[PDB]
Amino acid sequence: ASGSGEPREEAGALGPAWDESQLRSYSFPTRPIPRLSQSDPRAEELIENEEPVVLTDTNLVYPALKWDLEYLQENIGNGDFSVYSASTHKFLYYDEKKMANFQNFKPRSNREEMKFHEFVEKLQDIQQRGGEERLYLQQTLNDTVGRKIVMDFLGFNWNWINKQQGKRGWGQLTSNLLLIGMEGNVTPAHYDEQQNFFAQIKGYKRCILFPPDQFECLYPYPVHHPCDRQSQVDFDNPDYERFPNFQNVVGYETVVGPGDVLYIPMYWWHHIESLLNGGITITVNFWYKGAPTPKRIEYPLKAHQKVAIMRNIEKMLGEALGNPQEVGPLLNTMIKGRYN
Template sequence: MIKNNTVKKMTEKKNWDDTQIRKYDIQLEQIPRLNVDDPKIDELIAANRPVVITDTNLVGPALHWDLEYLEQHMGGGDYTVFLSRNHKFKYYDEKKSSHDFSPPTRRVDMKLAEFARRVRNWRRGDERLYLQQALNNTVGPAIVQDFLNFRWDWINSKQKSHSWGSLSSNLLLIALEGNVTPCHYDEQQNLFAQIRGHKRCVLFPPEQFECFYPYPVFHPHDRQSQVDFEHPDFIRFPKFKNAKGQEAVLGPGDVLYIPIYWWHHVESLMRGDYTLSINFWYKGTEKERTDPQPLG
């Protein structure tokens, strides 16, 4: 059974309750939660171990962001929004799609005003939405100024001291309550900053690769687990019983270090408000940036 006794300790200021957490048949313990000044943070990052970092003020200038502010200042461009008939938003690579592959979600371009309207008017049973947009030089000047006022001195020091490559992307994520990004891994270092609402992150180390039965490399769901956490098929995926992970619930201002190649499953808490997050993706090795440039 899930070790939900650790859930109670995940945030110092608990503005949510355990009924908002999905229940999984997985052994889980708490991700270390440390103040920004704790020297153990760098020890964990150097060892490629996850850690929740508090009081960084990394995205302090964005903590006032909400749909109204973004609607006013993001600009009139089109933004990438995924639509799903259920709460799951499993990533797929369109370049690897074949005629017999049916995408689990629809990707559409949407004005932020339309996205905000649909989020405000959303009711259970409606198609779910998830905005996932790289912040680049097309956004409005107020967003640019907020972005430039992030604590770049702090994050740049982490990049330098841990020999990460260049910043490749800042992805803005706006999700409905209860939205789930199923278990997968990324090939970059990630500092995941929570801005609004609460998200639960469940992580597993790369050495448990066999427990998650990833799709074949050439499948559109490459880097995704085939296991459905809510209804695991232990006949097809028996090693999933051996999975042991770590979890944390992130609130506004929290920053989670997700090490490169670590499996992670992310969900906005159920029956809460919409959530807003930004990730800072860094290459594992030095590489040149490519257009469009991330802000900064």
């Protein structure tokens, strides 16, 4: 019905940031992710318990809030940027290394390296031409990046995020992923194995999250499939015959805007959509390797540990059988008439 709640009113009486007609319609109920300040101890407790929370005042990417297409085009440099195209609004991602195991499936969102000015050229053409094609720039930011953007990076609130890394016992910061998308772009539900600080910069993104214990309801692809860690369920046209427990899924929902930081806990499903008719969206992700597994295991196992266990079983069988395609039949032989 309404998970994000009523839209926030922007300062200076500039009206509603968004309205619900910019959100896509789905079949499952949702509830709000808490919007808190970083000074609120409840926000600290949520991150500690690995629950999602939107922090409204970290100033994490404060110097990046002036970023738009033309400022980035003149300052980001002339490196290569990964640009993904799609004939539809859903951008299904593929592990290209795993595309050898599954030949009978074809990709529908091809990557293309290009210069940043070529991406801005390619985008504005689509708007004048009026085409239905969509693009999504998704590029880890390196040091081939120009002077002013390095200075902007230096202006990030490293004090706040470094102590978050320390107090949680997390591993190191693995990468910063810059993301520029078109309105209506959708990133279908999937989970990551790293802790994520999701720093919104330009435009608005509706984030629908599912806790790890709803693994049964979301049906991820086989670990060896190129779409590993993504849900097989089409949120627009869910197949309740193949995926009956998707009728039981309950999400956590929020809309992040400029200055907001969404903590996506490790192994939490998330479905991200750039608001319809909301313009371009800009986001920077912060990935941290999770804290190492504790000394002695505490029982019962947390849900994300069972997910980790299930991933390792699928990997092990893939190596033991010499062919990832035999994992399925072996698993069915194991349970049919014995555990089901």
